[PDB]
Amino acid sequence: GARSSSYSGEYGSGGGKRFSHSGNQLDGPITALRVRVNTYYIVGLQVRYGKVWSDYVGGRNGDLEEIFLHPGESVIQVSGKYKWYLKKLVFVTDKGRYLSFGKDSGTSFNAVPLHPNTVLRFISGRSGSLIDAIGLHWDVYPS
Ligand SMILES: [Cl-]
């Protein structure tokens, strides 16, 4: 039909419990990221949609890294690495910024939109005390 949405599928394990930011789309485009990291793993994730933060997922012991996107800036590619749990995330923006988090070891993955000229609209995944898995949802913005 007319829709340009696409979904990467889940990268990582089947552990933990599912989360989805699908209901956060209405708040706005992604405008900021919070990624909690310890020495080995991605511990936790929060994403700001417009002005409103998602409900935090993951554990709380770790360095809380945060990146604030520039006005009009979107993510167009996400890569990373996992081994048992998520270990590395790289958010690539349409302003050419490569926003890396975590430690550079594990099985690699690389997710780009399945329809051209769409951007990262929200994320889903699985979590517990760590981030077990992540999935990327792409769409046009504005809608
Ligand atoms: Cl694994």
Residue numbers in the entry: 20 to 162
Reproduce passages from the article.
ZG16 binds microbial pathogens, and lower ZG16 expression levels correlate with colorectal cancer, but the physiological function of the protein is poorly understood. An intriguing feature of ZG16 is a CXXC motif at the carboxy terminus.
Here, we describe crystal structures and biochemical studies showing that the CXXC motif is on a flexible tail, where it contributes little to structure or stability but is available to engage in redox reactions. ZG16 crystal structures also draw attention to a nonproline cis peptide bond that can isomerize within the protein and to the mobility of glycine‐rich loops in the glycan‐binding site.
